[PDB]
């Protein structure tokens, strides 16, 4: 059973006009099946829109394509994000997560998804107490994407919300 098409592609900005499908495919299937992959072109003119996409076969060849950034086709380094436009944060708000939830935590279930550079533990201003939600910021956008399209999130025992930060 195949994870969602969706879930498999990667919108690759930044890209030389002179990258074609056949150049695009050929870069980007050392990290995997590509089921499909084309160049965005003008109707008429046949002129690159600077930006293409490439399908994986399954999700682990998304994030294998993902690790090998920054990835360089014909001589320029493109822009790979996971799929109506992309917010690309860094930051996570965690909810849900009540007043036993620590730093730790936090950290041992996130590092998983990305190089973590702060976690934020909410407090309230007046008493100190904890407010029951959090913010995780990391070095890169591809862990909240990875984050955010996980149905679920258990840290610490809770079933947590996990949304972009701006
Ligand atoms: C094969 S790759 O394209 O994933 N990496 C090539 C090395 C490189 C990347 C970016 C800038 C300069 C060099």
């Known amino acids: 059973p195949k994870e969602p ?4 592609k990667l919108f690759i900005g ?8 056949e150049s695009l495919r050929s870069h980007f299937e050392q990290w995997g099946t590509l089921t499909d992959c084309v160049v965005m072109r003008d109707p008429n003119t046949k002129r690159s829109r600077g930006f293409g996409f490439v399908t ?3 999700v682990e060849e998304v994030d294998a394509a993902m690790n090998a950034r920054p990835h360089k086709v014909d001589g320029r380094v493109v822009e790979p994000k ?3 436009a992309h917010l ?5 708000f965690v909810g849900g997560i009540k007043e036993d939830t620590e730093e730790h935590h936090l950290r041992d279930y996130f590092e998983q998804y ?3 550079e702060v976690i934020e533990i909410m407090t309230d201003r007046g008493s100190g107490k904890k407010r029951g939600f959090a913010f995780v910021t990391f070095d ?11 149905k679920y999130h258990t840290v610490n025992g809770h079933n947590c919300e996990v949304r972009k930060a701006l």
Do not use: C, M, N
């Open 14 to 21: 930044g890209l030389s006009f002179e990258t074609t499908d």
């Open 82 to 84: 996971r799929a109506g």
């Open 56 to 58: 994986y076969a399954t």
């Open 5 to 8: 098409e969706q879930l498999r």
């Open 114 to 116: 990305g190089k973590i």
């Open 140 to 150: 890169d956008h591809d862990s909240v994407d990875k984050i955010v399209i996980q």
């Open 88 to 92: 690309t944060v860094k930051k996570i």
